Amino acid sequence: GPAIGIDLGTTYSCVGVFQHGKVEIIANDQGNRTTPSYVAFTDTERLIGDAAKNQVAMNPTNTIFDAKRLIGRKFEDATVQSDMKHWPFRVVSEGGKPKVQVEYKGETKTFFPEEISSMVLTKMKEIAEAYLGGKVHSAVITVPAYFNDSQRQATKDAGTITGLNVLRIINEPTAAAIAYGLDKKGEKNVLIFDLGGGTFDVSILTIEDGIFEVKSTAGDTHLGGEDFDNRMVSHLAEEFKRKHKKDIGPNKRAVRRLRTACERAKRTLSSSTQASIEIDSLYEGVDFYTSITRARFEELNADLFRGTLEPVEKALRDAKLDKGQIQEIVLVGGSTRIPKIQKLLQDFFNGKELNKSINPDEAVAYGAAVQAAILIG
Template sequence: MEEEVIGIDLGTTYSCAAYVDEHGAPKIIVNSFGTCTTPSVVAYDNEGKVLVGEAALQSAVDPKNIVYDSKRMIGRQFIDKPIQDDMKLWPFKVVDQVGKPHVELNINGQEKLVAPEEVSAEILKEIRGNVEHSLGKKISRAVITVPAYFDNKQRQETMNAAEKAGLTVLRLVSEPTAAAIAYNLSNQIDDNILIYDLGGGTFDVSIVKSHSGKKLLVLAIQGHTHLGGQDFDQGIMEYALEEFKSEGKSFPEDRPKAMKRLRTACMEAKHKLTFQDKPYEIQIECEGAVYTCMLTKEKLEEICGPKIRGTLDVVDQALKMAELKEDQIKYVLLVGGSTRIPLVQNLLKEKFGGEHKMLHGINPDHAVAHGAAIYAHMLKKVTPEPKPRIKDPETKPATTISAPVPPPHPSSALQLEVQDIIPLSIGFECRGGLFQPVIEKGTKFPYKKETTSCTAYDNQGSVFSGIYEGERANVKNNFKLGEVGLRLLNKKEKQGYKLKETFEIDINGILHVTTTEIATGNKAEIEISYNGCAHKEMNIETYVEESLRCAEEDQAFRDLIQTRNSFESTIYGKKRAIEKEMNDNKLSKPDGEKGLELLNSYLEWSDDFPQDKNVYAEKLKEL
């Protein structure tokens, strides 16, 4: 069977696939239900059958065995606040499995645990099957899109989902970049484009520099991995429930099927008011009672407004990162179904200077899949290059894939070069919990960097470091990606071992970390883990205020670590001086050992990490 490559937009609410036809035009694949998008929903029935998309939604399967939002769970820890908040809303049960969230199904009375990437794999299998049936071609390779702000663990688990679905990932590409590819090739833009991508469950802002449709460089990425249309639906539901109560009616919130119908009705109300000004009546019949609630366009904007306005703060952060002003943005590209909301468009027009700045032309639900398909077609016949070894993004040329792309018009042959950047800084945990960045946010990838370090204290038996992604000074506020543990064979004094840490980001934005003892070559590699501190997503409605508060907290924490390090350096200096005097016979052994014992007690005190930096100076005075 002939083989085809495709692009897949693996979405929170809906997923979509496309390919490039013989004329060089991207085409959306229509599924077996005759629609262009497939609901990202999976149902597990009592016969062991798995239903996906519309089949899952229309099934009579127990709502507790119908799973959605796998994209909001994938790569997350069970204790993360967004997971804990969503668990209160999901009809299905989510449990902790070695720190990782799993959905607990009940199949004929038997418990079955399903990981988020396994749910996503079922969606990818369904898409793959639909495409093979539609095109009559084998599908085994694809470009899959992810939110630009997805961290390393979320990207890795998406790769795992594709593997479980029998797909080889040609490339993971960020959703805004894919959308820019789709518009870039057809419009031949030669300027700065801001992509505002607000979908069902995630929000991204990317700024790219386009060079006449032939080169696409990502300048900035910002985002929020837990914001989208579903959050607006939830706000409408909460309003409707309050309205029902004000009329003296108590809606059966403990009934999953009733809540599912209410959510569907609220989503329908949101969609209707996107295109009409006339108030819309939400109406639900349940257990013989009729529940009604009138929703106006003004009330809808009141419900969604704070979150939507909060996204503009994220836009400002992206502009700051790219070192651009609003008037330096040529076009604003709207991606994702939630950008149809009039308030979103009006705020962006006001910010960037009018309707002429807004890019339209491709269905916002299809743009990402179109771009992914174009990129997949580019990579189809490209022989993979050796793994890149780039050390300095400022002085070394970027490694890119360049290949002929079937043009929108037969007369023009295009080349496309795509260069993406990492959304968050990556580094390791230093003693005391201080985050030490190795690869800075905004670095182009693929990329490799090596650092060196030493053991932190006397007689250190191992080097065990957490690897994190984020911008906060204290690692507990960042995303823990994994751990690297290396045993040291002999006991040596502080700084007795020299170590090399190698951080490498591959072409898909996946991290590889190795710690090597320089003298012996003994090494260890990163192991993915789900045992970090609970992560709290920054509140989009108070984004600026929280950012300022975090900056103050981070500086105070850095000052505390610096004070402690200075204290310990002073103590170690005194230890080395006593040891030298003992070796030179200038100090008796009893007196020397007494002094060393006292100094070691000070180090033990410091090892408990007192949180008041002033006590370190007081402790030194005792000496």
């Protein structure tokens, strides 16, 4: 004891505790209820989580994210060779295994993906110990349903290196179903729709007498909230050009700053119909203050939002199920807060109500925490 759940996400992680019959999701030292799965190596130190993400633009070659895309795989694997093309850090081979290669304290170092994930897990462990007091011993840690045994074991090894007793590795869609108590709610076919910052996972589960079976999986491992932000960046960069006769495109700091504003404006647009952009000296000392509507944001993303229904139809086909045979739909990932996404999914399911009352970026850690409590007794 205590009963701890960890969602070890590819870009963000979340930790929960089960205390007094209820889950508490734990904020970190910056007050954030999710923590970047980021590890940065500098001239003097190792930075993890927010501190690592906050200096990413300044130190991109020595700042690791997406270690979850490498964990448990071989360097020769097609996904690894493909992913390597879009990362600013170096990935190398040792005994056929991938490792990130970085500069740390003026020297070249290499780390297995489970070593990076262990550093992330140590941060999640310290986040829970600051909240609880004392030491955390045990955790349930989640993985995607399509992870194979090598990926599960290497995830566990990250827990081991961290010094956690890994009670169980469970599937992220299963954790989400557990958070909603769908294994105690009066067989059920459950669709989990998990749309994060850089991944889209659709899973179909069956649940009976507390037993979960994965029936099908589908999605896009390179689609998420970041793609929506890209569409807003291009729109507003064109507007800046139109109003100020300055093209920011070749200037990577100005583009990065616009993306930061767009990420935040997008978040506002899930609860308000307009968001304000307020950038001081975006380019050549010229301010960019402007306003963007929800309807404009939905327009710029018409394909990407409607496109999320294709993996739903595919997972149904693979499960050999009609959409009418789904008893529960669960929203997971920060992106499922987007109202237009909620509406497209609900209309597809003929007006069916969505399970969405639990913060969608917290649902996975929430169910992992419930599971930890069960196993600890």
